[PDB]
Amino acid sequence: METFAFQAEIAQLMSLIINTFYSNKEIFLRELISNSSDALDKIRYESLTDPSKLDSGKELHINLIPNKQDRTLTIVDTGIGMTKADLINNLGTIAKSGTKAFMEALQAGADISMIGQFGVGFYSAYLVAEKVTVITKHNDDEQYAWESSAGGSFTVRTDTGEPMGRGTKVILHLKEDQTEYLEERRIKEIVKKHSQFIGYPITLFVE
Ligand SMILES: O=C1c2ccccc2C2=C(c3nc4ccncc4[nH]3)CCCN12
Ligand SMILES: Cc1onc(-c2ccc(O)cc2O)c1-c1ccccc1
């Protein structure tokens, strides 16, 4: 396990998302499904030039998996996935410019719900999660686990868990007062409201 320090801008945004009072927390699911959708679009488009890019799996889908016992909501997609370079370096650059733009837009009067327009919608996960684990597999790299409970650091390690083939699994370790996001009726309500037109099958698993 390797430990990394978040740069100042993202660290400040993560603290804002965790601290600030905001009742409309359900938007996290739309943002994570949007990232999954974007990742799926990416592998699909690349497969048009190189069909062997789907040898790691032809299915293009999104699964929502609540687990009341573990107090986790897991989002699984078979998108392009992220390499080690993406997790540590590339997305760190994106986190900085996206945070700066978002903070500038907020200061003018923009709302937290507009986060995805700045490319940092992933961070809305901290509205409901005390810890986020990202297990990802890109065709050009090994399976990795990125994780952060905020507090200024994140970890990256090669993942030894169940092989994913290709894609990303985001495990949301929910805050104690955010268990409504494990209820079938609640998840169904959110997907219908914000993600009804996503171009991939969204399967809501039940327990
Ligand atoms: O979806 C997104 C996303 C979307 C936008 C920006 C970052 C991310 C992002 C990650 C990330 N790597 C980082 C390394 C250093 N500073 C911050 C970082 N943020 C890793 C997990 C997934 N992720
Ligand atoms: C590429 C890529 O490959 N997997 C993800 C991913 C990141 C987060 C997530 O919740 C689900 C995902 O599939 C992304 C991605 C990164 C930044 C913005 C949008 C998508």
PDB file of C-alpha atoms and ligand atoms in Angstrom:
ATOM      1  CA  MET A   1       0.000   0.000   0.000  1.00  0.00           C
ATOM      2  CA  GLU A   2       1.333   3.453  -1.072  1.00  0.00           C
ATOM      3  CA  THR A   3       0.063   6.660   0.638  1.00  0.00           C
ATOM      4  CA  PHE A   4      -0.271  10.014  -1.165  1.00  0.00           C
ATOM      5  CA  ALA A   5      -1.060  13.524  -0.072  1.00  0.00           C
ATOM      6  CA  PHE A   6      -3.893  15.391  -1.802  1.00  0.00           C
ATOM      7  CA  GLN A   7      -2.872  18.795  -3.172  1.00  0.00           C
ATOM      8  CA  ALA A   8      -4.369  21.815  -1.350  1.00  0.00           C
ATOM      9  CA  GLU A   9      -7.295  22.608  -3.738  1.00  0.00           C
ATOM     10  CA  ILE A  10      -8.883  19.054  -3.757  1.00  0.00           C
ATOM     11  CA  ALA A  11      -8.198  18.642  -0.024  1.00  0.00           C
ATOM     12  CA  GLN A  12     -10.127  21.900   0.591  1.00  0.00           C
ATOM     13  CA  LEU A  13     -13.005  20.782  -1.694  1.00  0.00           C
ATOM     14  CA  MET A  14     -13.206  17.376   0.092  1.00  0.00           C
ATOM     15  CA  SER A  15     -13.424  19.218   3.449  1.00  0.00           C
ATOM     16  CA  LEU A  16     -16.153  21.564   2.047  1.00  0.00           C
ATOM     17  CA  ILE A  17     -18.190  18.559   0.739  1.00  0.00           C
ATOM     18  CA  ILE A  18     -17.846  16.731   4.124  1.00  0.00           C
ATOM     19  CA  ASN A  19     -18.490  19.797   6.365  1.00  0.00           C
ATOM     20  CA  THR A  20     -21.062  22.098   4.613  1.00  0.00           C
ATOM     21  CA  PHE A  21     -24.806  21.667   5.384  1.00  0.00           C
ATOM     22  CA  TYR A  22     -26.596  20.514   2.170  1.00  0.00           C
ATOM     23  CA  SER A  23     -29.833  18.510   2.156  1.00  0.00           C
ATOM     24  CA  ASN A  24     -29.883  17.452  -1.571  1.00  0.00           C
ATOM     25  CA  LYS A  25     -27.261  14.651  -1.088  1.00  0.00           C
ATOM     26  CA  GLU A  26     -28.981  12.243  -3.562  1.00  0.00           C
ATOM     27  CA  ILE A  27     -27.094  13.907  -6.450  1.00  0.00           C
ATOM     28  CA  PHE A  28     -24.023  11.736  -5.596  1.00  0.00           C
ATOM     29  CA  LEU A  29     -25.652   8.757  -7.389  1.00  0.00           C
ATOM     30  CA  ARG A  30     -26.300  10.722 -10.601  1.00  0.00           C
ATOM     31  CA  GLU A  31     -22.608  11.879 -10.563  1.00  0.00           C
ATOM     32  CA  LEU A  32     -21.179   8.372 -10.066  1.00  0.00           C
ATOM     33  CA  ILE A  33     -23.501   6.884 -12.744  1.00  0.00           C
ATOM     34  CA  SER A  34     -22.384   9.779 -15.083  1.00  0.00           C
ATOM     35  CA  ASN A  35     -18.710   8.816 -14.518  1.00  0.00           C
ATOM     36  CA  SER A  36     -19.594   5.129 -15.156  1.00  0.00           C
ATOM     37  CA  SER A  37     -21.467   6.186 -18.330  1.00  0.00           C
ATOM     38  CA  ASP A  38     -18.481   8.284 -19.532  1.00  0.00           C
ATOM     39  CA  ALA A  39     -16.101   5.339 -18.882  1.00  0.00           C
ATOM     40  CA  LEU A  40     -18.425   2.981 -20.832  1.00  0.00           C
ATOM     41  CA  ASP A  41     -18.624   5.477 -23.737  1.00  0.00           C
ATOM     42  CA  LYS A  42     -14.789   5.517 -23.766  1.00  0.00           C
ATOM     43  CA  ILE A  43     -14.282   1.730 -24.055  1.00  0.00           C
ATOM     44  CA  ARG A  44     -17.186   1.463 -26.528  1.00  0.00           C
ATOM     45  CA  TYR A  45     -15.692   4.179 -28.806  1.00  0.00           C
ATOM     46  CA  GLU A  46     -12.153   2.647 -28.655  1.00  0.00           C
ATOM     47  CA  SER A  47     -13.632  -0.851 -29.466  1.00  0.00           C
ATOM     48  CA  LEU A  48     -14.970   0.603 -32.791  1.00  0.00           C
ATOM     49  CA  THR A  49     -11.312   0.939 -33.983  1.00  0.00           C
ATOM     50  CA  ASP A  50      -9.945  -2.043 -32.003  1.00  0.00           C
ATOM     51  CA  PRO A  51     -12.578  -4.771 -31.221  1.00  0.00           C
ATOM     52  CA  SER A  52      -9.972  -6.779 -29.175  1.00  0.00           C
ATOM     53  CA  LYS A  53     -10.358  -4.002 -26.522  1.00  0.00           C
ATOM     54  CA  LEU A  54     -13.545  -5.932 -25.518  1.00  0.00           C
ATOM     55  CA  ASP A  55     -11.662  -9.292 -25.021  1.00  0.00           C
ATOM     56  CA  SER A  56     -11.694  -8.338 -21.275  1.00  0.00           C
ATOM     57  CA  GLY A  57     -15.549  -8.349 -21.508  1.00  0.00           C
ATOM     58  CA  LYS A  58     -18.217  -7.452 -24.110  1.00  0.00           C
ATOM     59  CA  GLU A  59     -20.952  -6.476 -21.596  1.00  0.00           C
ATOM     60  CA  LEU A  60     -21.361  -2.696 -21.154  1.00  0.00           C
ATOM     61  CA  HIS A  61     -23.431  -2.131 -18.035  1.00  0.00           C
ATOM     62  CA  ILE A  62     -23.814  -0.514 -14.596  1.00  0.00           C
ATOM     63  CA  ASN A  63     -24.796  -2.468 -11.405  1.00  0.00           C
ATOM     64  CA  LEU A  64     -25.965  -0.830  -8.121  1.00  0.00           C
ATOM     65  CA  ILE A  65     -25.367  -3.116  -5.138  1.00  0.00           C
ATOM     66  CA  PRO A  66     -26.618  -2.154  -1.667  1.00  0.00           C
ATOM     67  CA  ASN A  67     -25.363  -4.072   1.378  1.00  0.00           C
ATOM     68  CA  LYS A  68     -27.177  -3.182   4.654  1.00  0.00           C
ATOM     69  CA  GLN A  69     -24.969  -5.500   6.794  1.00  0.00           C
ATOM     70  CA  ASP A  70     -21.720  -3.758   5.611  1.00  0.00           C
ATOM     71  CA  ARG A  71     -23.460  -0.319   5.214  1.00  0.00           C
ATOM     72  CA  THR A  72     -22.035  -0.003   1.667  1.00  0.00           C
ATOM     73  CA  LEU A  73     -23.458   1.000  -1.684  1.00  0.00           C
ATOM     74  CA  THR A  74     -21.328  -0.379  -4.514  1.00  0.00           C
ATOM     75  CA  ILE A  75     -21.491   0.884  -8.130  1.00  0.00           C
ATOM     76  CA  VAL A  76     -19.930  -1.479 -10.701  1.00  0.00           C
ATOM     77  CA  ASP A  77     -19.336  -0.633 -14.354  1.00  0.00           C
ATOM     78  CA  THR A  78     -17.533  -2.411 -17.183  1.00  0.00           C
ATOM     79  CA  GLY A  79     -16.105   0.856 -18.528  1.00  0.00           C
ATOM     80  CA  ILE A  80     -12.559   1.619 -19.717  1.00  0.00           C
ATOM     81  CA  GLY A  81     -11.162   1.589 -16.163  1.00  0.00           C
ATOM     82  CA  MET A  82      -8.220   3.565 -14.780  1.00  0.00           C
ATOM     83  CA  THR A  83      -4.471   2.770 -14.911  1.00  0.00           C
ATOM     84  CA  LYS A  84      -2.090   3.449 -11.961  1.00  0.00           C
ATOM     85  CA  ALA A  85      -0.976   6.632 -13.857  1.00  0.00           C
ATOM     86  CA  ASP A  86      -4.642   7.719 -14.125  1.00  0.00           C
ATOM     87  CA  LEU A  87      -5.323   7.143 -10.393  1.00  0.00           C
ATOM     88  CA  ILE A  88      -2.219   8.968  -9.125  1.00  0.00           C
ATOM     89  CA  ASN A  89      -1.138  11.475 -11.741  1.00  0.00           C
ATOM     90  CA  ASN A  90      -3.641  12.233 -14.509  1.00  0.00           C
ATOM     91  CA  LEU A  91      -6.734  12.463 -12.301  1.00  0.00           C
ATOM     92  CA  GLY A  92      -4.731  14.524  -9.780  1.00  0.00           C
ATOM     93  CA  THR A  93      -4.211  17.165 -12.505  1.00  0.00           C
ATOM     94  CA  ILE A  94      -7.962  17.002 -13.365  1.00  0.00           C
ATOM     95  CA  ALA A  95      -8.908  17.212  -9.619  1.00  0.00           C
ATOM     96  CA  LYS A  96      -6.851  20.460  -9.319  1.00  0.00           C
ATOM     97  CA  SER A  97      -8.189  22.291 -12.394  1.00  0.00           C
ATOM     98  CA  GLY A  98     -11.756  21.018 -11.823  1.00  0.00           C
ATOM     99  CA  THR A  99     -11.744  22.070  -8.145  1.00  0.00           C
ATOM    100  CA  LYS A 100     -10.357  25.567  -9.005  1.00  0.00           C
ATOM    101  CA  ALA A 101     -13.080  26.061 -11.659  1.00  0.00           C
ATOM    102  CA  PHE A 102     -15.828  24.731  -9.332  1.00  0.00           C
ATOM    103  CA  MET A 103     -14.731  26.958  -6.387  1.00  0.00           C
ATOM    104  CA  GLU A 104     -14.635  30.029  -8.706  1.00  0.00           C
ATOM    105  CA  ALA A 105     -18.125  29.167 -10.047  1.00  0.00           C
ATOM    106  CA  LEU A 106     -19.500  28.635  -6.461  1.00  0.00           C
ATOM    107  CA  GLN A 107     -18.092  32.048  -5.321  1.00  0.00           C
ATOM    108  CA  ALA A 108     -20.109  33.697  -8.142  1.00  0.00           C
ATOM    109  CA  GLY A 109     -23.246  31.905  -6.825  1.00  0.00           C
ATOM    110  CA  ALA A 110     -23.314  28.372  -8.431  1.00  0.00           C
ATOM    111  CA  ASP A 111     -24.766  25.433  -6.516  1.00  0.00           C
ATOM    112  CA  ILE A 112     -23.026  22.218  -5.306  1.00  0.00           C
ATOM    113  CA  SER A 113     -25.459  20.312  -7.675  1.00  0.00           C
ATOM    114  CA  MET A 114     -23.448  21.713 -10.664  1.00  0.00           C
ATOM    115  CA  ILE A 115     -20.243  19.787  -9.552  1.00  0.00           C
ATOM    116  CA  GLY A 116     -20.297  17.420 -12.596  1.00  0.00           C
ATOM    117  CA  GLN A 117     -19.982  20.383 -14.986  1.00  0.00           C
ATOM    118  CA  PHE A 118     -16.472  20.775 -13.506  1.00  0.00           C
ATOM    119  CA  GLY A 119     -15.458  17.117 -14.019  1.00  0.00           C
ATOM    120  CA  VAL A 120     -15.136  16.475 -10.230  1.00  0.00           C
ATOM    121  CA  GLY A 121     -18.605  14.952  -9.654  1.00  0.00           C
ATOM    122  CA  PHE A 122     -16.880  11.825  -8.249  1.00  0.00           C
ATOM    123  CA  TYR A 123     -16.185  13.891  -5.057  1.00  0.00           C
ATOM    124  CA  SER A 124     -19.934  14.321  -4.400  1.00  0.00           C
ATOM    125  CA  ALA A 125     -19.579  10.708  -3.029  1.00  0.00           C
ATOM    126  CA  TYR A 126     -18.311  12.417   0.214  1.00  0.00           C
ATOM    127  CA  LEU A 127     -21.796  13.924   0.734  1.00  0.00           C
ATOM    128  CA  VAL A 128     -22.879  10.388   1.795  1.00  0.00           C
ATOM    129  CA  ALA A 129     -19.681   8.313   2.330  1.00  0.00           C
ATOM    130  CA  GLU A 130     -17.111   8.449   5.140  1.00  0.00           C
ATOM    131  CA  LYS A 131     -14.764   6.348   2.926  1.00  0.00           C
ATOM    132  CA  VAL A 132     -14.647   5.645  -0.807  1.00  0.00           C
ATOM    133  CA  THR A 133     -12.835   2.652  -2.336  1.00  0.00           C
ATOM    134  CA  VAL A 134     -12.277   2.561  -6.093  1.00  0.00           C
ATOM    135  CA  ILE A 135     -11.285  -0.882  -7.505  1.00  0.00           C
ATOM    136  CA  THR A 136     -10.400  -0.503 -11.181  1.00  0.00           C
ATOM    137  CA  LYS A 137      -8.970  -2.478 -14.088  1.00  0.00           C
ATOM    138  CA  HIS A 138      -7.844  -0.892 -17.372  1.00  0.00           C
ATOM    139  CA  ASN A 139      -6.784  -3.149 -20.315  1.00  0.00           C
ATOM    140  CA  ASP A 140      -3.216  -1.711 -20.190  1.00  0.00           C
ATOM    141  CA  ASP A 141      -2.613  -2.187 -16.437  1.00  0.00           C
ATOM    142  CA  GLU A 142      -3.178  -4.369 -13.332  1.00  0.00           C
ATOM    143  CA  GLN A 143      -6.201  -4.209 -10.984  1.00  0.00           C
ATOM    144  CA  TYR A 144      -5.761  -1.378  -8.416  1.00  0.00           C
ATOM    145  CA  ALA A 145      -7.537  -0.175  -5.275  1.00  0.00           C
ATOM    146  CA  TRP A 146      -7.618   3.650  -4.718  1.00  0.00           C
ATOM    147  CA  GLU A 147      -9.090   4.661  -1.337  1.00  0.00           C
ATOM    148  CA  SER A 148      -9.621   7.755   0.789  1.00  0.00           C
ATOM    149  CA  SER A 149     -11.478   8.738   3.962  1.00  0.00           C
ATOM    150  CA  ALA A 150     -10.451  12.366   3.164  1.00  0.00           C
ATOM    151  CA  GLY A 151      -8.270  13.786   5.970  1.00  0.00           C
ATOM    152  CA  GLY A 152      -5.729  14.847   3.309  1.00  0.00           C
ATOM    153  CA  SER A 153      -4.460  11.495   1.975  1.00  0.00           C
ATOM    154  CA  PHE A 154      -5.347   8.578  -0.294  1.00  0.00           C
ATOM    155  CA  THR A 155      -3.842   5.146  -0.818  1.00  0.00           C
ATOM    156  CA  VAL A 156      -3.229   3.065  -3.969  1.00  0.00           C
ATOM    157  CA  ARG A 157      -2.369  -0.666  -3.894  1.00  0.00           C
ATOM    158  CA  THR A 158      -2.474  -3.564  -6.394  1.00  0.00           C
ATOM    159  CA  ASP A 159      -5.800  -5.277  -5.637  1.00  0.00           C
ATOM    160  CA  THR A 160      -5.923  -9.008  -4.733  1.00  0.00           C
ATOM    161  CA  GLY A 161      -9.740  -9.256  -4.578  1.00  0.00           C
ATOM    162  CA  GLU A 162     -12.037 -10.837  -7.175  1.00  0.00           C
ATOM    163  CA  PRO A 163     -10.688 -10.093 -10.735  1.00  0.00           C
ATOM    164  CA  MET A 164     -12.994  -7.670 -12.567  1.00  0.00           C
ATOM    165  CA  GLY A 165     -11.942  -8.280 -16.187  1.00  0.00           C
ATOM    166  CA  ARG A 166     -12.262  -4.524 -16.975  1.00  0.00           C
ATOM    167  CA  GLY A 167     -14.031  -1.588 -15.367  1.00  0.00           C
ATOM    168  CA  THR A 168     -14.528   0.140 -12.036  1.00  0.00           C
ATOM    169  CA  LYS A 169     -16.179  -0.730  -8.724  1.00  0.00           C
ATOM    170  CA  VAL A 170     -16.826   2.222  -6.382  1.00  0.00           C
ATOM    171  CA  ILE A 171     -17.597   1.133  -2.815  1.00  0.00           C
ATOM    172  CA  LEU A 172     -19.281   3.822  -0.759  1.00  0.00           C
ATOM    173  CA  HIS A 173     -18.823   3.207   2.990  1.00  0.00           C
ATOM    174  CA  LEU A 174     -21.879   5.186   4.087  1.00  0.00           C
ATOM    175  CA  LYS A 175     -22.083   7.729   6.901  1.00  0.00           C
ATOM    176  CA  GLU A 176     -24.292   6.418   9.754  1.00  0.00           C
ATOM    177  CA  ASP A 177     -27.157   8.852   8.970  1.00  0.00           C
ATOM    178  CA  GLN A 178     -27.126   8.101   5.189  1.00  0.00           C
ATOM    179  CA  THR A 179     -28.514   4.502   5.223  1.00  0.00           C
ATOM    180  CA  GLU A 180     -31.573   5.579   3.166  1.00  0.00           C
ATOM    181  CA  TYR A 181     -29.248   5.004   0.131  1.00  0.00           C
ATOM    182  CA  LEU A 182     -29.323   1.221   0.840  1.00  0.00           C
ATOM    183  CA  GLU A 183     -33.169   1.094   0.437  1.00  0.00           C
ATOM    184  CA  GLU A 184     -34.477  -0.336  -2.845  1.00  0.00           C
ATOM    185  CA  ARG A 185     -37.333   2.229  -3.089  1.00  0.00           C
ATOM    186  CA  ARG A 186     -34.920   5.142  -2.491  1.00  0.00           C
ATOM    187  CA  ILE A 187     -32.294   4.017  -5.042  1.00  0.00           C
ATOM    188  CA  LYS A 188     -35.087   3.313  -7.623  1.00  0.00           C
ATOM    189  CA  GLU A 189     -36.519   6.857  -6.977  1.00  0.00           C
ATOM    190  CA  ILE A 190     -33.061   8.503  -7.585  1.00  0.00           C
ATOM    191  CA  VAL A 191     -32.182   6.552 -10.740  1.00  0.00           C
ATOM    192  CA  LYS A 192     -35.664   7.370 -12.195  1.00  0.00           C
ATOM    193  CA  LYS A 193     -35.297  11.096 -11.332  1.00  0.00           C
ATOM    194  CA  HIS A 194     -31.687  11.706 -12.509  1.00  0.00           C
ATOM    195  CA  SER A 195     -30.400   8.784 -14.612  1.00  0.00           C
ATOM    196  CA  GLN A 196     -33.431   7.433 -16.557  1.00  0.00           C
ATOM    197  CA  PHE A 197     -31.789   8.128 -19.971  1.00  0.00           C
ATOM    198  CA  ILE A 198     -28.282   6.666 -19.358  1.00  0.00           C
ATOM    199  CA  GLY A 199     -27.356   4.639 -22.492  1.00  0.00           C
ATOM    200  CA  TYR A 200     -26.429   1.468 -20.579  1.00  0.00           C
ATOM    201  CA  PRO A 201     -28.480  -1.012 -18.572  1.00  0.00           C
ATOM    202  CA  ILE A 202     -28.577  -0.014 -14.878  1.00  0.00           C
ATOM    203  CA  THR A 203     -29.438  -3.051 -12.731  1.00  0.00           C
ATOM    204  CA  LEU A 204     -30.487  -2.298  -9.155  1.00  0.00           C
ATOM    205  CA  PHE A 205     -29.517  -5.434  -7.163  1.00  0.00           C
ATOM    206  CA  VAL A 206     -31.644  -6.291  -4.168  1.00  0.00           C
ATOM    207  CA  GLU A 207     -30.951  -8.182  -0.930  1.00  0.00           C
TER     208      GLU A 207
HETATM  209  O1  LIG B   1     -13.538   9.618 -10.766  1.00  0.00           O
HETATM  210  C1  LIG B   1     -12.534  10.179 -10.346  1.00  0.00           C
HETATM  211  C2  LIG B   1     -12.109  11.589 -10.515  1.00  0.00           C
HETATM  212  C3  LIG B   1     -12.700  12.632 -11.226  1.00  0.00           C
HETATM  213  C4  LIG B   1     -12.036  13.854 -11.300  1.00  0.00           C
HETATM  214  C5  LIG B   1     -10.810  14.035 -10.660  1.00  0.00           C
HETATM  215  C6  LIG B   1     -10.232  12.999  -9.935  1.00  0.00           C
HETATM  216  C7  LIG B   1     -10.884  11.764  -9.876  1.00  0.00           C
HETATM  217  C8  LIG B   1     -10.501  10.467  -9.331  1.00  0.00           C
HETATM  218  C9  LIG B   1      -9.387  10.005  -8.637  1.00  0.00           C
HETATM  219  C10 LIG B   1      -8.299  10.847  -8.116  1.00  0.00           C
HETATM  220  N1  LIG B   1      -7.017  10.530  -8.180  1.00  0.00           N
HETATM  221  C11 LIG B   1      -6.357  11.598  -7.582  1.00  0.00           C
HETATM  222  C12 LIG B   1      -4.988  11.805  -7.387  1.00  0.00           C
HETATM  223  C13 LIG B   1      -4.612  12.985  -6.767  1.00  0.00           C
HETATM  224  N2  LIG B   1      -5.473  13.918  -6.341  1.00  0.00           N
HETATM  225  C14 LIG B   1      -6.779  13.697  -6.540  1.00  0.00           C
HETATM  226  C15 LIG B   1      -7.285  12.555  -7.159  1.00  0.00           C
HETATM  227  N3  LIG B   1      -8.524  12.047  -7.519  1.00  0.00           N
HETATM  228  C16 LIG B   1      -9.190   8.545  -8.298  1.00  0.00           C
HETATM  229  C17 LIG B   1     -10.513   7.818  -8.091  1.00  0.00           C
HETATM  230  C18 LIG B   1     -11.517   8.142  -9.187  1.00  0.00           C
HETATM  231  N4  LIG B   1     -11.524   9.559  -9.614  1.00  0.00           N
HETATM  232  C1  LIG B   2     -11.881   6.906 -17.469  1.00  0.00           C
HETATM  233  C2  LIG B   2     -12.632   6.397 -16.295  1.00  0.00           C
HETATM  234  O1  LIG B   2     -12.622   5.052 -16.117  1.00  0.00           O
HETATM  235  N1  LIG B   2     -13.378   4.740 -14.953  1.00  0.00           N
HETATM  236  C3  LIG B   2     -13.813   5.899 -14.487  1.00  0.00           C
HETATM  237  C4  LIG B   2     -14.728   5.983 -13.320  1.00  0.00           C
HETATM  238  C5  LIG B   2     -14.496   6.909 -12.297  1.00  0.00           C
HETATM  239  C6  LIG B   2     -15.386   7.054 -11.247  1.00  0.00           C
HETATM  240  C7  LIG B   2     -16.547   6.292 -11.213  1.00  0.00           C
HETATM  241  O2  LIG B   2     -17.480   6.524 -10.238  1.00  0.00           O
HETATM  242  C8  LIG B   2     -16.790   5.345 -12.201  1.00  0.00           C
HETATM  243  C9  LIG B   2     -15.884   5.182 -13.243  1.00  0.00           C
HETATM  244  O3  LIG B   2     -16.140   4.239 -14.197  1.00  0.00           O
HETATM  245  C10 LIG B   2     -13.368   6.993 -15.322  1.00  0.00           C
HETATM  246  C11 LIG B   2     -13.723   8.433 -15.189  1.00  0.00           C
HETATM  247  C12 LIG B   2     -12.814   9.338 -14.636  1.00  0.00           C
HETATM  248  C13 LIG B   2     -13.131  10.690 -14.550  1.00  0.00           C
HETATM  249  C14 LIG B   2     -14.360  11.155 -15.016  1.00  0.00           C
HETATM  250  C15 LIG B   2     -15.274  10.261 -15.551  1.00  0.00           C
HETATM  251  C16 LIG B   2     -14.964   8.902 -15.626  1.00  0.00           C
END
